[PDB]
Ligand binder design. Structure first.
Ligand SMILES: CCCCCCCCCCCCCCCCCC(=O)OC[C@H](COP(=O)([O-])OCC(O)COP(=O)([O-])OC[C@@H](COC(=O)CCCCCCCCCCCCCCCCC)OC(=O)CCCCCCCCCCCCCCCCC)OC(=O)CCCCCCCCCCCCCCCCC
Ligand SMILES: CCCCCCCCCCCCCCCCCC(=O)OC[C@H](COP(=O)([O-])OCC(O)COP(=O)([O-])OC[C@@H](COC(=O)CCCCCCCCCCCCCCCCC)OC(=O)CCCCCCCCCCCCCCCCC)OC(=O)CCCCCCCCCCCCCCCCC
Ligand SMILES: CCCCCCCCCCCCCCCCCC(=O)OC[C@H](COP(=O)([O-])OCC(O)COP(=O)([O-])OC[C@@H](COC(=O)CCCCCCCCCCCCCCCCC)OC(=O)CCCCCCCCCCCCCCCCC)OC(=O)CCCCCCCCCCCCCCCCC
Ligand SMILES: CCCCCCCCCCCCCCCCCC(=O)OC[C@H](COP(=O)([O-])OCC(O)COP(=O)([O-])OC[C@@H](COC(=O)CCCCCCCCCCCCCCCCC)OC(=O)CCCCCCCCCCCCCCCCC)OC(=O)CCCCCCCCCCCCCCCCC
Ligand SMILES: CCCCCCCCCCCCCCCCCC(=O)OC[C@H](COP(=O)([O-])OCC(O)COP(=O)([O-])OC[C@@H](COC(=O)CCCCCCCCCCCCCCCCC)OC(=O)CCCCCCCCCCCCCCCCC)OC(=O)CCCCCCCCCCCCCCCCC
Ligand SMILES: CCCCCCCC/C=C/CCCCCCCC(=O)OC[C@H](COP(=O)(O)OCCN)OC(=O)CCCCCCC/C=C/CCCCCCCC
Lengths: 62, 68, 37, 119, 269, 119
């Protein structure tokens, strides 16, 4: 398993490793925080659907 | 026997307050609000309440200064 | 001295006429803190 | 480098600085959290940071490094081992080049020579 | 112009490895099902970061995972002395307001840091060093005065202390040199010609037997009769070794009203 | 000893200690509280503690020392004169044997020689 962690490196040279994983071209235009906005924002969207539960008893929905 | 009709009454009023807080507060205070004080008294209530909340926020911000 | 030994290094009398020009330095009781709110 | 199994807890406490960390002995209770069977000798559990390393090897032998090693008892062993050798390397260097920072050092608060008392 | 991927992505080949540390059947079953539908699941969250999208940490049930903080005995009491022992429990109990406050830095290590001297103070040092290597020290008084004037006084105190620390570290490294380069009594007259042609492997378990009786099968054929005969021989040698015994030394820690010496503790109570 | 009429107020403030007292100039307003007529020259009012001394003499000439000197304007003049010469005697000795305690002294926070910077 320690040799499996280095599997994608054995097929590459050092120059290819640096260009592949180290020298990623700079691009600061992405909305990186969309991952959190989708996750935490899902609580509000889930509430919009959940506030319509056809459970007749009020205390059941409580 | 006790009055079993009053069971869990504090929970039920809590959930009704969460369901519609302004509707619960409105009707629970209707007869009391029939006597309305002057504009001065009402303004002093809001002025002193928001002033106390403003100082509370400044005390919270000072606690972050002491933590730093 | 009078039945007493007080060990001190060799005193330099030339240190008396040491030109020490006074420099400005003002203390402000009531100034700036590190952080503010 | 500590050349024993045990060390004085106060010898690694600061004298002129606030004490916000300790250098505790190896947490032997974490060894009983491993559910699988293993052989561990008591003669290796006291030396600093080594028990956590042997636990990590036992966990990396029973399980691998993917989706089976990621269990609370095995990740804490790897985290404690990594953290232990990092603190001990820092306290060891501070013990070598800053011996006067710790309680018990004669240079933390130097006692004067008798010639300095003027008697 | 595709977004860059970190090295961890090529290990897992997916951005959605549903890794949950809580090892219960309900959690791992739901994680395996969610791991399979992550391509078409709108309720999918990344745990492998990328250049274009951030990611979440390791999950613990519905909450998030973080290892137990390394055991620390420092704490602060509120109502009564709790005698907190970080080694008494597996997981650290939460700090209640009326019970205890733990030490700062749940996840922190000890490092050495340094302040960065002001930029104008750095420029005066570069001017002095440059003027020194070109014109010599004797023609750099003005540049030396600019350092004493422009650099704030705290910076000059830091510069003064660095020289005193590195003087201390120099003496410590040289005392280690003397102890290391000291020729012991068992190496008198021995040079590199007396060294054996052995490497690190020649001192390991395969070539050098450890000092334990069951390291290998060396003593597995020893019968009880040979044991009794050995006890007789080791007692015959003791007729010459037991004749001498070191004398008992005086107790330097006799007076309990005196700061005791940190003497070597006895092996056994 | 101060060899002038005026002194820098900051030169008698401590640098490494809390400043709980100052060495203020003569309180010229107390001179106007004397009800009687007297002759005072402006050339004598700035030198330390002397104005309070002259006020005491003027009060002890108009009144005596019994039941007439005991008025608020005369007792404050004598109290200020006694307190002023006590504080100045203490500050004078502290200025002579502890010059490093005050703001403006080159020894309060000594600037190092260039030979100590290791450049
Ligand atoms: C045509 C006729 C019908 C034929 C088809 C019939 C079959 C239909 C099913 C197939 C089609 C489904 C379509 C979507 C495909 C999804 C495929 C999939 O794998 O999803 C698995 C999906 C996700 O699994 P998961 O990984 O475990 O994530 C849920 C975790 O809770 C997550 O927890 P977390 O903590 O890890 O993360 C928090 C989470 C937030 O999660 C939460 O907070 C929810 C927590 C639940 C409440 C807590 C109480 C839980 C109680 C436990 C027991 C629950 C049992 C419920 C069983 C429900 C069975 C479905 O936030 C997020 O991660 C991101 C959320 C934002 C996502 C963006 C929203 C896109 C949704 C799609 C939009 C378009 C659809 C139309 C609009 C919706 C309809 C009006 O499983 C679910 O279904 C979860 C329940 C969601 C409610 C579903 C209600 C919508 C149903 C729509 C039906 C059609 C509309 C009505 C039409 C009527 C006329 C026909
Ligand atoms: C060996 C292995 C096994 C070991 C097992 C160990 C466990 C032992 C199990 C056996 C224990 C139970 C024994 C049988 C009990 C039978 C008694 C009975 O007949 O029922 C009486 C009682 C009668 O209630 P009720 O007549 O319907 O109405 C109450 C009145 O009408 C009043 O209603 P109200 O509307 O006027 O409201 C007032 C009410 C409640 O109003 C309150 O002010 C209390 C509020 C507490 C909740 C909030 C706490 C604040 C923190 C959270 C904030 C919430 C905010 C929410 C909103 C969000 C923010 C706005 O005041 C009360 O205190 C009522 C509590 C029930 C009375 C009992 C005497 C209490 C006096 C001392 C009070 C102090 C303790 C209170 C504890 C919490 C009470 C819910 O029923 C029960 O409470 C049932 C409790 C027993 C359920 C057993 C469940 C199964 C047990 C096994 C589960 C596994 C446990 C594992 C534990 C693991 C170790 C940690
Ligand atoms: C005592 C002095 C100190 C007081 C301290 C302050 C107290 C807390 C204040 C907090 C303020 C939050 C504001 C919320 C905005 C609500 C706006 C609104 O119009 O309210 C209607 C709104 C209902 O409108 P709706 O959306 O159409 O829901 C009706 C559906 O039929 C619903 O369907 P259903 O009827 O079938 O369900 C049963 C019903 C009744 O059953 C229950 O509610 C009982 C269960 C309660 C569980 C315990 C709740 C713990 C706290 C909630 C969770 C943490 C906060 C989450 C974020 C809330 C803020 C938006 O549930 C509900 O009513 C709605 C569910 C409650 C929320 C449940 C989910 C919580 C998480 C939300 C996820 C979505 C947002 C993501 C998070 C955002 C983070 C960035 O009520 C609420 O949602 C909750 C009210 C919150 C305030 C309650 C306390 C207010 C009064 C406090 C005392 C006032 C003193 C000053 C007055 C002086 C008088 C003289
Ligand atoms: C989690 C947060 C924890 C901390 C906060 C906790 C907050 C708890 C308190 C909640 C609110 C108080 C509860 C009120 C009960 C329900 C309402 C009510 O009073 O029923 C109406 C009822 C009669 O009113 P009404 O029937 O409608 O007749 C009036 C007509 O409409 C026409 O009016 P009128 O022409 O006949 O007379 C003019 C007007 C007279 O003009 C006034 O209304 C006087 C008040 C003007 C504004 C005063 C400043 C605003 C105060 C709130 C803002 C906080 C200030 C910051 C505090 C900093 C220091 C903590 O009369 C009135 O309108 C009602 C005055 C009766 C006194 C009002 C109740 C006491 C003042 C409010 C308590 C403040 C406590 C909040 C802070 C607590 C912090 C621990 O009043 C009574 O219950 C009778 C009780 C005896 C009252 C007179 C003697 C009072 C002796 C105690 C004074 C306590 C002062 C505390 C000062 C705070 C510290 C500086
Ligand atoms: C040809 C004539 C010109 C045309 C006139 C047309 C006028 C149009 C009238 C329309 C009325 C407004 C309609 C909508 C509002 C109705 C709902 C309402 O809230 O009314 C209050 C309503 C009724 O009040 P009330 O307790 O029944 O008292 C009724 C009267 O005030 C009577 O109370 P009283 O019987 O106890 O009388 C004694 C009086 C005793 O007063 C006096 O004896 C003399 C007062 C002298 C004032 C001294 C000023 C000193 C200034 C020093 C400033 C120095 C700092 C400046 C620094 C500047 C920078 C350097 O003391 C007061 O009551 C003063 C009340 C507050 C006065 C504030 C404005 C004063 C100046 C108004 C100028 C308007 C033009 C007048 C032209 C005519 C001149 C002859 O109060 C409520 O309970 C409803 C809710 C109130 C919630 C409070 C917070 C609400 C905030 C928003 C309010 C609405 C938006 C703003 C609208 C204007 C409000 C001020
Ligand atoms: C949200 C309001 C919608 C209506 C808007 C009306 C007003 C119109 C005025 C808009 C002015 C536009 C100003 C510029 C906005 C810029 C938008 C932005 O910053 O985010 C874009 C950003 C681009 O991402 P990157 O590739 O990382 O960045 C590359 C940048 N070149 O978009 C995103 O991150 C995706 C999130 C955006 C919102 C997504 C909405 C999701 C709603 C879900 C409902 C759809 C149903 C889903 C069903 C799923 C079925 C499998």
């Amino acid at each position: 398993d320690f040799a499996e962690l280095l599997r994608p490196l054995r097929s590459l040279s050092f120059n290819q490793v640096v260009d592949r994983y180290v020298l990623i071209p700079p691009n600061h235009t992405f909305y990186r925080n969309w991952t959190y906005e989708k996750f935490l924002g899902g609580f509000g969207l889930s509430y919009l659907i959940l506030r319509e539960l056809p459970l007749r008893n009020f205390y059941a929905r409580v | 026997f006790p009055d079993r009709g009053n069971k869990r009454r504090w929970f039920k009023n809590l959930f009704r307050l969460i369901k519609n807080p302004m509707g619960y507060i409105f009707w629970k205070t209707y007869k009391a609000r029939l006597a309305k004080p002057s504009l001065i008294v009402t303004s002093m209530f809001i002025g002193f309440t928001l002033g106390f909340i403003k100082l509370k926020a400044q005390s919270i911000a000072y606690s972050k200064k002491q933590y730093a | 001295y009078e039945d007493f030994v007080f060990t001190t290094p060799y005193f330099q009398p030339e240190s008396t006429f040491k030109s020490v020009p006074k420099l400005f330095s003002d203390i402000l009781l009531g100034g700036v803190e590190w952080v503010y709110t | 480098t500590i050349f024993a199994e045990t060390w004085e807890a106060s010898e690694y406490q600061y004298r002129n600085k606030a004490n916000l960390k300790t250098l505790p002995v190896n947490h032997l209770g974490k060894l009983a959290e491993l559910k699988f069977d293993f052989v561990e000798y008591k003669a290796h559990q006291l030396i600093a940071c080594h028990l956590y390393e042997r636990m990590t090897i036992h966990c990396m032998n029973q399980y691998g490094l993917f989706k089976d090693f990621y269990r609370p008892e095995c990740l804490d062993a790897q985290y404690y081992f990594k953290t232990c050798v990092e603190l001990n390397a820092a306290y060891g260097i501070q013990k070598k080049f800053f011996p006067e920072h710790f309680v018990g050092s004669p240079y933390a608060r130097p006692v004067p020579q008798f010639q300095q008392l003027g008697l | 112009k595709a977004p860059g991927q970190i090295y961890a992505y090529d290990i897992h080949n997916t951005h959605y490895p549903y890794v949950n540390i809580k090892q219960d059947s309900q959690t791992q079953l739901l994680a395996s099902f969610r791991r399979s539908i992550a391509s078409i699941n709108p309720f999918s969250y990344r745990q492998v970061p990328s250049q274009d999208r951030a990611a979440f940490g390791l999950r613990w049930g519905n909450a998030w995972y973080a290892p137990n903080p390394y055991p620390n005995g420092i704490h602060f009491d509120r109502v009564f002395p709790t005698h907190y022992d970080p080694l008494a429990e597996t997981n650290r109990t939460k700090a209640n307001l009326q019970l205890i406050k733990y030490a700062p830095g749940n996840y922190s290590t000890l490092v050495v840091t340094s302040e960065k001297l002001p930029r104008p103070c750095i420029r005066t040092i570069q001017n002095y060093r440059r003027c020194q290597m070109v014109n010599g020290t004797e023609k750099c008084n003005s540049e030396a005065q600019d350092i004493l004037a422009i650099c704030p006084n705290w910076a000059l105190d830091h510069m003064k202390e660095k020289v005193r620390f590195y003087t201390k570290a120099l003496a410590i490294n040289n005392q280690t040199y003397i102890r290391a380069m000291q020729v012991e009594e068992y190496n008198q007259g021995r040079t590199v010609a007396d060294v054996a042609p052995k490497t690190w492997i020649h001192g390991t378990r395969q070539h050098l037997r450890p000092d334990t009786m069951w390291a290998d099968d060396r003593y597995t054929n020893i019968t009880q009769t040979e044991i009794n005969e050995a006890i007789k021989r080791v007692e015959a040698r003791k007729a010459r070794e037991h004749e001498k015994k070191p004398v008992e030394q005086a107790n330097v820690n006799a007076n309990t009203g005196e700061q005791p010496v940190r003497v070597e503790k006895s092996l056994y109570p």
